[PDB]
Amino acid sequence: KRIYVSYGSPVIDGEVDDIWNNVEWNIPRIYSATTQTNAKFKLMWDDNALYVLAEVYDPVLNSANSTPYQQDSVEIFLDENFDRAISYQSDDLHYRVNYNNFKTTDAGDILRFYTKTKLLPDGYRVEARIALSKKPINGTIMGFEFQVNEADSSARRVATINMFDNTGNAWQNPSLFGEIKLKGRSDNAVVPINP
Ligand SMILES: [Ca+2]
Ligand SMILES: [Ca+2]
Ligand SMILES: [Ca+2]
């Protein structure tokens, strides 16, 4: 399905900007297995970037496994041109960041990915910026997926949460991503600053 993303420019610092309170939480509900871990995320776009704010409720954080997706982490997938190919093209992105703000890329230039995290009582927050190469405008559609990897005190992933893909294959197949459609940018956006 489809998330409508409002226009806005947050500060990347792990703190919830006032402007994030004006957009709605998306609740990923595709669980690989039962778990008390849950998550939500918000999206925002500006002329240069897509923005993700994720919060994860997770009472045990573990990142001892050397395999990235076997640590408590969130992953962001983007099909920027909206090709919806069945395998990864040159414009497809798959990024990951753990609760300690350690980032990995499975696809795309990691120089585009800028993140901060914050430890919360019972969980963590990720605030992420992905620099866009195509100029977005109102009505732009991109493919998007969001995933949480939940690891336990055995230092292994025991569960996944997904927004859109229930098949375990977003890492391989962009056509499984959902859609985001960008709206809300003013056309004028001018006039003087009135004090
Ligand atoms: Ca912020
Ligand atoms: Ca693509
Ligand atoms: Ca965990």
Residue numbers in the entry: 21 to 215
Sentences from the study reporting this entry:
The hyperthermophilic bacterium Caldicellulosiruptor kristjansonii encodes an unusual enzyme, CkXyn10C-GE15A, which incorporates two catalytic domains, a xylanase and a glucuronoyl esterase, and five carbohydrate-binding modules (CBMs) from families 9 and 22. C. kristjansonii has been shown to grow on a variety of polysaccharides, including cellulose, xylan, starch, and pectin, with an optimal growth temperature of 78 °C. From the N-terminus, CkXyn10C-GE15A consists of two CBM22 domains (CBM22.1 and CBM22.2), a GH10 endo-xylanase (Xyn10C), three CBM9 domains (CBM9.1, CBM9.2, and CBM9.3), a GE from CE15 (GE15A), a cadherin domain, and two surface layer homology (SLH) domains believed to anchor the protein to the Gram-positive cell wall. We have determined the structures of the third CBM9 domain (CBM9.3) and the glucuronoyl esterase (GE15A) by X-ray crystallography.
To gain a deeper insight into the molecular determinants for carbohydrate binding of CBM9.3, we determined the structure using X-ray crystallography. The putative sugar-binding site was easily identifiable from comparisons with TmCBM9-2, and in CBM9.3, it is formed by the aromatic residues Tyr89, located on α-helix 2 between β-strands 4 and 5, and Trp191, located on a loop between β-strand 11 and α-helix 4. CBM9.3 shows metal-binding sites for the three calcium ions similar to those of TmCBM9-2, although the calcium ion near the loop between β-strands 4 and 5 in CBM9.3 is present at only approximately 50% occupancy. Additionally, although the overall structure of CBM9.3 is very similar to that of TmCBM9-2, the binding site appears to be much more open in CBM9.3 compared to a pocketlike site in TmCBM9-2. The C-terminal linker region included in the construct is observed as an extended tail seen in CBM9.3.
